[PDB]
Amino acid sequence: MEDFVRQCFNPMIVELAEKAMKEYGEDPKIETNKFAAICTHLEVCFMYSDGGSKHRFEIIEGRDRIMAWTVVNSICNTTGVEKPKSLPDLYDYKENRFIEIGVTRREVHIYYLEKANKIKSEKTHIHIFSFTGEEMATKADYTLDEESRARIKTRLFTIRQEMASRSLWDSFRQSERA
Ligand SMILES: O=C(NCCc1ccccc1)c1nc([C@@H]2CCCN2C(=O)c2c(Cl)cccc2Cl)[nH]c(=O)c1O
Ligand SMILES: [Mn+2]
Ligand SMILES: [Mn+2]
Ligand code: NA
């Protein structure tokens, strides 16, 4: 599974994921499912931001903390939107709202509720993907067109199939905690 991650994901994603783990004292060579999950969430955030017109989205996830908040605080100043209590994943210039992206190994509704309680910043929009093709979004508003969302869902499915072909999927699927 460590070799799986290093083979499956772009090196920039893998480096960001290793850093995120190390900043909390975790070893990517040991907590390997966590390693994969963080890689997956990052790649989904980058694909989402490529999903619309050029310049439609601002990426917040994947930046160091100081630059992430500089982006958020900048956007709050130029558009007047409310400042979130915690770092979101993207800003949508078209809809003028922050977006929290979730990727789940359980199912989308339990995760949606959890991030609704976890974030609770009433203004941030929540969009969840599963590995089996379900999605769930705030007020049933899915932001991107069907083509873009289809591309994300197809990519998660491929990862699932690839894990299972290597016999890693069952441990990964069971490793996500409330
Ligand atoms: O922005 C995120 N994290 C910002 C920093 C942060 C760090 C801890 C708690 C809150 C926020 C973020 N995080 C997660 C999930 C759930 C919370 C932790 N986590 C991780 O991926 C994760 C990371 Cl980052 C580092 C080490 C281990 C893990 Cl398990 N899911 C998201 O969808 C997401 O957007
Ligand atoms: Mn995030
Ligand atoms: Mn997220
Ligand atoms: Na979060």
Author numbering: 1 to 53, 73 to 197
Give the text the authors published on this PDB structure.
The influenza virus RdRp is a heterotrimer that includes the polymerase catalytic subunit (PB1), the ‘cap-binding’ subunit (PB2), and the endonuclease-containing (PA) subunit. The ‘cap-binding’ and endonuclease functionalities of RdRp work in concert to perform the essential ‘cap snatching’ of host mRNAs to generate primers for viral transcription. The essential endonuclease domain within the PA subunit is a particularly attractive drug target. The chemical scaffold for our studies is 4,5-dihydroxypyrimidine-6-carboxamide (DHPC), which was originally developed by Summa and coworkers (Merck, Italy) into the first-in-class HIV two-metal integrase inhibitor raltegravir (Isentriss)30.
An important feature in the discovery of new antivirals is the ability to show potency in the face of resistance mutations. Thus, our approach starts with endonucleases that incorporate single point mutation or two point mutations so that we can identify inhibitors that can retain significant activity even when these two known resistant mutations are combined in the influenza viral endonuclease construct.
